[PDB]
Amino acid sequence: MENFQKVEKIGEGTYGVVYKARNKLTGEVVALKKIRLDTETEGVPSTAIREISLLKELNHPNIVKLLDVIHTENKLYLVFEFLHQDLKKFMDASALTGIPLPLIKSYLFQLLQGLAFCHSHRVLHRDLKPQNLLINTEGAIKLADFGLARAFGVPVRTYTHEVVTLWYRAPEILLGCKYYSTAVDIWSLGCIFAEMVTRRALFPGDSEIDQLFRIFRTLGTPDEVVWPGVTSMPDYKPSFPKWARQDFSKVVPPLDEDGRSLLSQMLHYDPNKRISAKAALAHPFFQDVTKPVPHLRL
Ligand SMILES: CCc1nn(-c2c(Cl)cc(Cl)cc2Cl)c2nc(Cc3ccc(O)c(O)c3)[nH]c(=O)c12
Numbered sequence: 001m002e003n004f005q006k007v008e009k010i011g012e013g014t015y016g017v018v019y020k021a022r023n024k025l026t027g028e029v030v031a032l033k034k035i036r037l038d039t040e041t042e043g044v045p046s047t048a049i050r051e052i053s054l055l056k057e058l059n060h061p062n063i064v065k066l067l068d069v070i071h072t073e074n075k076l077y078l079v080f081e082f083l084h085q086d087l088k089k090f091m092d093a094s095a096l097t098g099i100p101l102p103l104i105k106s107y108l109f110q111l112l113q114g115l116a117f118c119h120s121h122r123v124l125h126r127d128l129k130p131q132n133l134l135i136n137t138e139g140a141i142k143l144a145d146f147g148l149a150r151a152f153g154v155p156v157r158t159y160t161h162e163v164v165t166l167w168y169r170a171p172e173i174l175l176g177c178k179y180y181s182t183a184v185d186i187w188s189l190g191c192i193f194a195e196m197v198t199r200r201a202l203f204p205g206d207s208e209i210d211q212l213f214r215i216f217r218t219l220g221t222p223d224e225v226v227w228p229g230v231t232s233m234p235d236y237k238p239s240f241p242k243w244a245r246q247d248f249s250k251v252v253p254p255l256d257e258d259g260r261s262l263l264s265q266m267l268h269y270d271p272n273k274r275i276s277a278k279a280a281l282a283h284p285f286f287q288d289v290t291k292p293v294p295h296l297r298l
Helices: 046-055 087-093 101-120 183-198 208-219 257-266
Strands: 004-011 018-023 029-034 066-072 075-081 133-136 140-143
Touching: 004 029, 018 075, 046 066, 046 075, 087 133, 101 140, 101 183, 183 257
Parallel strands: none
Antiparallel strands: 004 018, 018 029, 029 075, 066 075, 133 140
16 A cells, blocks of 8 residues: 555465555554455455454454554555564574573463453454464564454465465364364464474374374374264264373473473363463463563564
8 A cells, every 4th residue: 555665575474465564654664464365355345344343442462453454445454563573483593492481481471361352352363373473572472363364264275375284273173163162272372382392393284184183193082071072073083093192291391290281271172171361371380470581683
C-alpha cells in the first residue's frame, strides 16, 4: 500500500508475504503482511474481515499487536508491530551452548500468559512454531499470527510449495478430530519446550503418518485407558502398531523433575486431560522465575 515505504522482505510466511515497512504519516517501523490470493481476492470474505477485525481488540503484552487492517483494492493487508528476531533463529544461534534455563523458563512463563489471555476469549492459535515466536532486546517474547491461523485456513503447501510443518501438531488433529480445543496450543508449546532443552525437535515428522507414529513411539500407542474415545476417532486405525511408552528422563535430559512433570501434563494424550495455560502458570516449575535479558547483537 502507498502510505508504506517498504524496507525489506522479512520472510515468506504462510498466509503471504511479510515486509518490514515504514509508515509515512506515523513514522513507525512495522510488519506488513500481504495476505495470499484467495484469501485476498476476490475480495475478502465478509467473514475473513469480521474475524480479523476482532483480533484488533485482543491486545496483550505477549501478543504482537495488530496495528491496522487495510481492506482496500480488494486486497488485504495487515500491519503488525515489528519484531527484530524470531525464536527459531535464536535457537539456531544458541545451538552450541543451548539456551540458558532461566531464559527458557522466562520464555515459557510469558508464552503461557498470552495463550491464557487468548484462550479466555476463546481464541486459539492452531499453528504454534518457533518461527512465529518473536523476541526483543528487553528479554521478551510474543505470539505472532494468532487467530489468522484459522480465519483463512492453514495451507498445506507453504509457500511456495515446500510443506507447512507437522512437527508441532497435536494428535487429535492428526487423527481427524474436527472440533478441537485450546489443548492443541498446549500440545505445541510442550513440543516447543522440549526443543529448547534438548536442542532437537521432539517429533520431526515428514508426513502425517510419520508424525503420528513418531509420537506413538515415544509416548506409547494410545488405548482407551489413557484416551477414552480414541478408537472411534476418524482416521484411527486398529492396524496402528502398538509401541511402548518411553520414560521422560530419556527423552528430555537433563530437565529437572518439576520440568518433567510440567512437560508430561502438556503432553497428555487426552485433550481434556492436558494441563491448561492457567494451571500451568501455577506449576512449581515457575518457582524461581526471573526475567533475563538475552544476547542479541546487530
Ligand atoms: C509479526 C510480523 C512478522 N511476521 N514474521 C514471520 C512469522 Cl511470525 C512467521 C513466518 Cl513462517 C515468517 C515470518 Cl516472515 C516475522 N518475522 C520476523 C523475524 C525477522 C526479522 C528481521 C528479518 O530481516 C527477518 O528476515 C526475519 N519479524 C517480524 O516482525 C515478523
